[PDB]
Amino acid sequence: NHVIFKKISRDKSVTIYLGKRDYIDHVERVEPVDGVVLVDPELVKGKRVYVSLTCAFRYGQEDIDVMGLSFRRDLYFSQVQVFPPVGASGATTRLQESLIKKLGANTYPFLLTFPDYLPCSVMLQPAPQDVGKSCGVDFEIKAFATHSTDVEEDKIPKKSSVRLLIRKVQHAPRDMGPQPRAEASWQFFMSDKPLRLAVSLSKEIYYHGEPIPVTVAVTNSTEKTVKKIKVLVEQVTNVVLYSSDYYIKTVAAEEAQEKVPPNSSLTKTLTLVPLLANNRERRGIALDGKIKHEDTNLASSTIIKEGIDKTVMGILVSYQIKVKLTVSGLLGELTSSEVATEVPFRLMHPQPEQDENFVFEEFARQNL
Amino acid sequence: NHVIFKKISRDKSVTIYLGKRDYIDHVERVEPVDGVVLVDPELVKGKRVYVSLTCAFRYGQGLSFRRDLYFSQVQVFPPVGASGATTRLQESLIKKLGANTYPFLLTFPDYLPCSVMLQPAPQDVGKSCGVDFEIKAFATHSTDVEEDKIPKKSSVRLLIRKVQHAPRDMGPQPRAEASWQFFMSDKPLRLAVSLSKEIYYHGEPIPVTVAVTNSTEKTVKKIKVLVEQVTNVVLYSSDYYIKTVAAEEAQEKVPPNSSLTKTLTLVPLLANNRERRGIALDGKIKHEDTNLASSTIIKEGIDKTVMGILVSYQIKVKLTVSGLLGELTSSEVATEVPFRLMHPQPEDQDENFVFEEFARQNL
Amino acid sequence: NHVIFKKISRDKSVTIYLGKRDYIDHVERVEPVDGVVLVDPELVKGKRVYVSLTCAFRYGQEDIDVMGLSFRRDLYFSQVQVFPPVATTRLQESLIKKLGANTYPFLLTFPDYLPCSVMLQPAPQDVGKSCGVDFEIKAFATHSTDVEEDKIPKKSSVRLLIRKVQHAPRDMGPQPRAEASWQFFMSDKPLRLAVSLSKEIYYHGEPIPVTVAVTNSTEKTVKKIKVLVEQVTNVVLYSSDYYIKTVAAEEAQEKVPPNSSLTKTLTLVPLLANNRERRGIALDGKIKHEDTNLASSTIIKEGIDKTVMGILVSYQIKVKLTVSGLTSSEVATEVPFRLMHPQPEDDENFVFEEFARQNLK
Amino acid sequence: NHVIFKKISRDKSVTIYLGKRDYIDHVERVEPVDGVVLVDPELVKGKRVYVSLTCAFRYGQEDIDVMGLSFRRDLYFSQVQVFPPVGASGATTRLQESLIKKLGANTYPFLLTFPDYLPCSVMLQPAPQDVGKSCGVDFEIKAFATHSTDVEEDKIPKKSSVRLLIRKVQHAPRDMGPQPRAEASWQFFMSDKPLRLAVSLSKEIYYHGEPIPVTVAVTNSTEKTVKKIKVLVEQVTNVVLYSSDYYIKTVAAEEAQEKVPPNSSLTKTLTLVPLLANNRERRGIALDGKIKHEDTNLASSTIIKEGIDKTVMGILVSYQIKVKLTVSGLLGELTSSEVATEVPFRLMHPQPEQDENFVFEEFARQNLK
Ligand SMILES: O=P(O)(O)O[C@H]1[C@@H](OP(=O)(O)O)[C@H](OP(=O)(O)O)[C@@H](OP(=O)(O)OP(=O)(O)O)[C@H](OP(=O)(O)O)[C@H]1OP(=O)(O)O
Ligand SMILES: O=P(O)(O)O[C@H]1[C@@H](OP(=O)(O)O)[C@H](OP(=O)(O)O)[C@@H](OP(=O)(O)OP(=O)(O)O)[C@H](OP(=O)(O)O)[C@H]1OP(=O)(O)O
Ligand SMILES: O=P(O)(O)O[C@H]1[C@@H](OP(=O)(O)O)[C@H](OP(=O)(O)O)[C@@H](OP(=O)(O)OP(=O)(O)O)[C@H](OP(=O)(O)O)[C@H]1OP(=O)(O)O
Ligand SMILES: O=P(O)(O)O[C@H]1[C@@H](OP(=O)(O)O)[C@H](OP(=O)(O)O)[C@@H](OP(=O)(O)OP(=O)(O)O)[C@H](OP(=O)(O)O)[C@H]1OP(=O)(O)O
Ligand SMILES: O=P(O)(O)O[C@H]1[C@@H](OP(=O)(O)O)[C@H](OP(=O)(O)O)[C@@H](OP(=O)(O)OP(=O)(O)O)[C@H](OP(=O)(O)O)[C@H]1OP(=O)(O)O
């Protein structure tokens, strides 16, 4: 029934159990991390075991014959004690009670909460053409044992520790108002005659995998012909911590072969689905995980909370529909000119919503 | 059918024959001046005949300022050494003209400018100036022990041109990006300009690609693209000229929160300019074969001042923006992209000769 | 004997007269620009003449075989009409009398949220391009149709690049010494470094007495004491460029042996004159000009985003101690201070001059 | 005075002589194995004598009795005939000509060459804490006699064979990599201020026994104190054939006595010498020979040649400088992690360069305790 994710320390003294790999941010609040640590009471005798939740922005990558540039900023750190027991985590959950019963009396609960001022899982490995380096926001759940002298020696032995890279996934809020169409229009005067472009989306928020119906209305009062209409989903990424890196990548494209001749108008609805699967080249785009992993998608739209400096988000991700019109010259070779406009939208995961049966699995994510 | 250019001295004692009026500079090397002098053996008896190549910068309309940039002289009569032609053109001319025909070869060095001159307009401060190239054949004689003489009547001068042709190399594809944030606006106006290549030829069309990204709440009302010629006199007087030698005004406007990409084609030509004063030419205004001056090409470790007149070309793109002019700026929204303008690359038996007067055809 | 600065348009239709090249910012308020425009009434018939004050940040430079990157942000724009004619000053009344009835006054004021004249031409070693904050006074004539065609003809316009110079405020409290101390534990024994300046604000050309107190309780020797004035420049608009340059240095030959203490006062004078290489340093004008100095300390006003200053300039005293081993180690510390021009001052005869600033070599 | 290494077969019929125990790999090419076999012509009558060079990766214990206790992958095998003599039979090298003269007319030369795609002598005996078993790359020079029986079965007796475990030792090329450098910075939770660490080595290649000057620049703009600066030489071992075993061990450590207080910077050069002698515990570390032997050192850096699959190297060995900063009021307050950076470098042996007089010795390597 309920799949539980487990990882064990090298020295087999500390084992951590989580209900999920991915924890839901739905704007209003964030799903807290409720898990249990199974200690070997022999191997933790006279020792203290803690669990920490760390959110960190990182920037840099390994390059041969290049100077190693690394940068880390911790955006959140919290730590509770699981052993010896003290009820650090306060009130308990059903998942914990059920796991304690199944695992035995050496099982201790932890609850680490997320605040409201953190970004969601975003990371980016650049392409050859791209100027800056690998960067991302990681979320680490680390259970580790300290000795009674190790607090004075500032030592946390590696073999007694276990770390899990969880994801903070952006879901839509549960109460949302009815959604107005995302629609703009432009009037491109050419020889004092207008070329009018109206672009309309069904709504403002789309879900990963959901088709985006882009309605394009070209009214051509000019003496020129609209030769081509290209519609893109562009992902715009702004690294806002160590280096002001900028990425703009097409994650979906449809190119109609419609012409709009002089003194005529054309309305057309193209459907685009921005998906990581569409992109052979998975570098230079904001993902919510590593390229190698299967459960990795396009990064959701950053949602900056009121009175929160955007820089503490580390990487800003936004999506837009771009419409390019190729317009004929009167007589030339590249006299053909292009006009383009953008319509912003947000992309995220859908809204969120006994005695359990537990199947235990290694936390490690499946590859491709 | 090879056209040969001839000029004859007043006293008919010395006649000079050149293959060309215009000699090719293609950066790597410069085409030397290979010609022949036909003497009247009666009228040069006991006389010596020389041919000189002089490059001089002049400034003024009496005679105001001269700087000699190069001088070389050879002897044609009496004959020097083997006296056999060094080129096919000479061998062929000697055969056609007879045994009173003597070859000369005057070479150009690599540190000289090309034919540039400038006659100013009423609006312009500063005077006429230019770099001239003179081929002069003249006879010397002595009636005294105490002095040799050089009569004007025994001399013949030709004003040849050193014409700039393209090298094998081209510079990287020229590109500019400019952006403006006007007073009280959080939003940029981005202008990107691109040319197909770095070197264009006289008469060749220049495709200027302009990318206006307008994130402002203002409208780009006009996009004007110019070829500007920039002239810097660098010897007697620090005179500066900047003139439009081509202009195209796109019909498209760029409304708020939109972007426009557009390719305008310009051809910088002397023919476009009714007013031919205040611009760097490669010859006199009156002459038909006169064009816009080619881009100066300063060689490494050569002081730019020995070029006399520096000529450069650039594409200027001016954006006219609504509701700033007089309101959020007293200035102009523009960027420049440099390029070089010159003549095409060079192309790398017994001839039939038609002889013509060297004098260039007028308008 | 008041020296007046004049410049005339190409078409000789508009001539502008200013009292100063340099206008004083003393934190509390900024000295406004009071001048006059002399029109040729024949050449401005049916035309309107305006004067604008523009403050702009610029970034970029011309480079052969390199992509031309240019960037401008206007930080302030204001415009008044001088012709046809629409409180005055003594300088204006006096200039009108001397020049005639075709002379019209203008007053353009500065707000409190602008930086002062700062610019920077980089060195070979430096990444990043030329940038600066310029102040333009431009007098120009428009035609009666030119307001509808959005056109300002160049030949009818005249521009002056004035400076906004940072002076200290006129009422200032008594100044606490700028002092910090550090304890560098070495084998659990402290090496204590105290650095102290006489005051917090120094003037360009004023000597800075740096008092350095080394207390060495370690078993190591302080072999060398170097004291620097470092200029720190942060470009904060187009590109996050960073410069740190020594504009003054004194290297004592003092040793502080184990279990001893040494107090020493070095005097440094941060000056552009000390620097042969004048590139990679924040100046208040062009390198070529004579009246150009080191840029004054940026003074960010409360609740003003530092980014609208364009270039941030700060000064600090750096103390480097070379400490022996048994290879040697270097410890260093910084003490911030502010550098600016002194406090301002609690029928005329006019000599007219071209606005163009005097050069060096 | 050239020391020659000799081993003799149990039956005294075949004796092998080598100039060296250790043969030089300097990237560009590898020093070939030039030796001679002395046969007893009575005891090899109607017999053929060969010499083989085998490079093999092994994992587990050495095969006992009949049981296969080892995983074996052969990376190179070559064999030549010494007896009866092949062709001209004259020496190809000065060492051979000289040995033939000194030993007599029953002395026959052999030359076995190394290719460019092999690893160098690497082996590893694990510690109690370590998962995974003993493994290594061995180089065997084996001289052995074959004879034919009355049924058409040829025989290779153990008693007629002699095997020598030579080493392929990594010496430096002509090229060196660029001066290695790292920069790291941290902004801790609730701190607006960076802690900057810059690390620099003098060069990219160091020799065994050569001191490594590690220059560390700590710029501390934080309100916290750097309480400790520890600098390590870490050896990283990756077994890449039978089992994906990973080892990372400190082979040298220096702890600076300086602390870096708030709003200060410290530049400091610590000298480390990564040596097997520093390590009492010699298990869990990549060596170039057996622990018991005296001439055994730390394994040199693996040098993977272009377009050669790294798996045919068997064991990958790399070295790095690690700098750990211990920062006040962090551990269990603003981090459950470590403040550290790594700078890679390569560790190997130095660059290479009448009748001579021979002293003969047993090939067996000298032990310790
Ligand atoms: O800092 P390092 O590189 O020296 O290593 C850590 C620790 O590694 P870790 O941090 O990954 O857990 C070592 O264990 P391992 O890497 O072999 O597992 C431990 O060695 P140990 O107990 O003798 O173990 P064995 O001899 O039985 O192998 C060492 O102790 P010291 O050097 O003697 O103080 C520790 O140093 P510190 O920071 O002072 O606590
Ligand atoms: O360094 P890391 O975080 O990037 O990941 C490394 C490795 O770290 P180390 O070898 O530098 O010590 C991880 O080991 P521990 O952190 O558990 O100690 C290991 O497990 P993991 O973190 O659970 O798995 P992930 O979801 O992170 O992939 C991971 O597994 P593999 O994907 O199957 O190879 C490796 O991936 P890679 O780097 O792509 O080779
Ligand atoms: O001073 P210059 O160089 O400008 O030339 C003068 C004149 O110079 P002089 O004063 O020494 O006599 C030339 O006579 P010569 O001394 O060379 O024999 C003459 O012939 P040219 O050189 O073949 O012809 P171009 O190609 O130079 O025009 C030229 O053309 P004509 O008008 O058709 O007579 C004149 O032009 P200008 O006065 O501008 O009209
Ligand atoms: O294209 P260019 O660069 O050669 O410009 C010409 C002129 O074009 P033209 O040669 O086709 O007639 C421009 O007018 P348009 O192209 O808009 O018609 C005019 O600009 P403007 O102020 O907006 O307009 P006006 O009110 O003065 O007409 C410009 O004046 P400046 O740059 O201010 O000095 C002129 O310069 P110059 O040659 O010195 O007199
Ligand atoms: O944009 P700029 O500040 O670089 O100025 C340009 C030029 O402006 P334009 O070409 O845009 O019209 C100025 O001309 P006008 O103001 O008289 O119209 C000129 O004099 P200037 O600034 O008054 O003189 P000073 O203050 O320096 O004495 C200045 O000469 P330089 O003395 O060598 O600097 C030029 O500099 P450049 O080309 O870099 O050498």
Do A199 and A336 fall into the same domain? yes
Do A200 and A239 fall into the same domain? yes
Torsion of CA C210, C216, C220, C225, to 10 degrees: 10
Q: Is D10 part of a structural domain of the chain? A: yes
DSSP string, D288-315: SS-TTBSS--BPPPP-PPTT--GGGGSE
Residues whose CB is less than 8 angstroms from the CB of residue D109 and which lie 6 or more positions away in sequence, other chains included? D34, D35, D36, D82, D89, D90, D91, D92, D93, D96, D100
Quote the minimal CA–CA distance from B175 to chain C in Å: 5
Report residue D43 as tokens: 């005891």
- Among C54, C64, C142, select the one facing B326 at the smallest CB separation: C142
Residues whose CB is less than 8 angstroms from the CB of residue A188 and which lie 6 or more positions away in sequence, other chains included? A194, A195, A196, A197, A339, B252, B253, B254, B255, B258, B260
Q: Is D368 part of a structural domain of the chain? A: no
Do C11 and C119 fall into the same domain? yes
Chain B and chain C share a number of CB contacts under 8 A equal to 73
Pocket probe mutation, ligand 1, options D250, D319, D339, max atoms within 8 Å of Cβ: D250
Do C75 and C62 fall into the same domain? yes
Distance of CA C212 from the midpoint of ligand 5 (Å): 46
Quote the minimal CA–CA distance from C70 to chain B in Å: 4
Number of domains into which chain B is organized: 2
- Cβ pair B88, B98 in contact under 8 A: no
Q: Residue D192 and residue B7: Cα distance in Å, rounded?
A: 85
Report residue C304 as tokens: 């003003």
Half-sphere exposure of A28 (CA within 13 A, CB side): 7
Q: Is B363 part of a structural domain of the chain? A: no
Which residues are registered as beta bridge partners of B292? B281
- Cβ pair B162, B20 in contact under 8 A: no
Do C293 and C215 fall into the same domain? yes
Residue bearing tokens 């002001």? A244
With an 8 Å Cβ cutoff, the interface of chain A facing chain B consists of: 184, 186-191, 332-342
Quote the minimal CA–CA distance from C6 to chain B in Å: 19
Which residues are registered as beta bridge partners of D282? none
Pocket probe mutation, ligand 3, options B18, B115, B158, B159, max atoms within 8 Å of Cβ: B159
Cβ distance C150 to B175 less than 8 Å, yes or no, reads no
Phi and psi at residue C40, to the nearest 5°: -90, 105
- Cβ pair B166, B199 in contact under 8 A: yes
CATH of the domain at A50: 2.60.40.840
User: Ligand 1: which residues within 6 Å by Cβ?
Assistant: A 155, 157-159; D 129, 232, 250, 253, 281
Taking CA atoms, C147 is separated from B180, C143, D314, in Å, by: 22, 7, 81
The total number of residues written for chain D in this structure: 369
Q: Is C361 part of a structural domain of the chain? A: no
Q: Is C359 part of a structural domain of the chain? A: no
Residue of B nearest to C60 (CA): B178
Report residue B184 as tokens: 């009280």
Q: Is C297 part of a structural domain of the chain? A: yes
Q: Which atom of ligand 5 is nearest to the CA of C358?
A: 28
Q: Which residues of C touch B178 (CB under 8 A)?
A: 60, 68, 70-72
**Using the 8-state DSSP alphabet, how is residue C295 labeled?**
P
Distance of CA D324 from the midpoint of ligand 1 (Å): 13
Q: Residue C336 and residue C317: Cα distance in Å, rounded?
A: 6
Q: Is D338 part of a structural domain of the chain? A: yes
Report residue C179 as tokens: 């002092």
Distance of CA B136 from the midpoint of ligand 3 (Å): 13
Q: Residue B211 and residue B228: Cα distance in Å, rounded?
A: 20
Residues whose CB is less than 8 angstroms from the CB of residue C252 and which lie 6 or more positions away in sequence, other chains included? C224, C225, C226, C227, C264, C266
A283, amino acid identity? R
The total number of residues written for chain A in this structure: 368
Beta strand residue intervals within D125-161, DSSP E: 135-148, 154-155
**Any idea which ligand is nearest the CA of D326?**
1
Q: Residue A331 and residue B280: Cα distance in Å, rounded?
A: 32
Phi and psi at residue B90, to the nearest 5°: -70, -55
Pocket probe mutation, ligand 4, options C138, C142, C148, C151, max atoms within 8 Å of Cβ: C151
Count the Cβ atoms, other than its own, within 10 Å of residue B321: 22
Residue of D nearest to A58 (CA): D186
Ligand 4 pocket check for C10: Cβ under 6 Å:
no
C250 three-state secondary structure: strand
Burial class (CB in 10 A: 0-12, 13-18, 19+), B110: exposed
Exposed e or buried b per residue across A50-89, where buried means at least 16 C-beta atoms within 10 angstroms of its C-beta? bbbbbbbbbbbeeeeeeebbbbbbbbbbebbbbbeeeebb
DSSP string, B247-259: EEEESB-B-TTEE
**Using the 8-state DSSP alphabet, how is residue A157 labeled?**
-
End-to-end CA distance of chain C: 29
Q: Is C309 part of a structural domain of the chain? A: yes
Q: Which residues of C touch D271 (CB under 8 A)?
A: 327
Q: Which residues of B touch C151 (CB under 8 A)?
A: 325
Residues whose CB is less than 8 angstroms from the CB of residue B51 and which lie 6 or more positions away in sequence, other chains included? B16, B35, B37, B73, B74, B76, B104, B106, B135, B136, B137
**Any idea which ligand is nearest the CA of C151?**
4
**Using the 8-state DSSP alphabet, how is residue C207 labeled?**
-
- Among D187, D336, D342, select the one facing A52 at the smallest CB separation: D336
DSSP string, C76-142: EEEEEEEES-----HHHHHHHHHH-TTEEEEEE---SS---SEEE---TT--S--EEEEEEEEEEEE
End-to-end CA distance of chain D: 29
Closest to B114 (Cα-Cα) out of B240, B293, B280: B293
A25 three-state secondary structure: strand
Do D209 and D252 fall into the same domain? yes
Half-sphere exposure of D245 (CA within 13 A, CB side): 27
Q: Do chains D and A touch (3 or more CB pairs under 8 A)?
A: yes
Number of H helices, E strands in chain D: 1, 21
Q: Residue D179 and residue C231: Cα distance in Å, rounded?
A: 30
Q: Residue A226 and residue A336: Cα distance in Å, rounded?
A: 9
Interface test with B, best of C51, C58, C65, C77 (most B CBs within 10 A): C77
Which domain does B270 fall in, by range?
Answer: 175-342
With an 8 Å Cβ cutoff, the interface of chain B facing chain A consists of: 207, 209, 251-255, 257-263, 265
Burial class (CB in 10 A: 0-12, 13-18, 19+), B334: middle
Do D339 and D356 fall into the same domain? no
- Cβ pair B227, B315 in contact under 8 A: yes
- Cβ pair D205, D176 in contact under 8 A: yes
Do B336 and B352 fall into the same domain? no
Resolution (A): 2.6
Cβ distance B329 to C54 less than 8 Å, yes or no, reads yes
Do C182 and C150 fall into the same domain? no
Count the Cβ atoms, other than its own, within 10 Å of residue A159: 12
Report residue A358 as tokens: 């537990």
Do D128 and D66 fall into the same domain? yes
Residues whose CB is less than 8 angstroms from the CB of residue C286 and which lie 6 or more positions away in sequence, other chains included? C119, C292, C357
- Cβ pair A60, A134 in contact under 8 A: yes
**Using the 8-state DSSP alphabet, how is residue B312 labeled?**
E
Do D57 and D100 fall into the same domain? yes
Phi and psi at residue D153, to the nearest 5°: -100, 120
Do D27 and D58 fall into the same domain? yes
Quote the minimal CA–CA distance from C60 to chain B in Å: 9
Q: Which stretch of DSSP H or E encloses residue A203?
A: none
CATH of the domain at C202: 2.60.40.640
Distance of CA C152 from the midpoint of ligand 4 (Å): 10
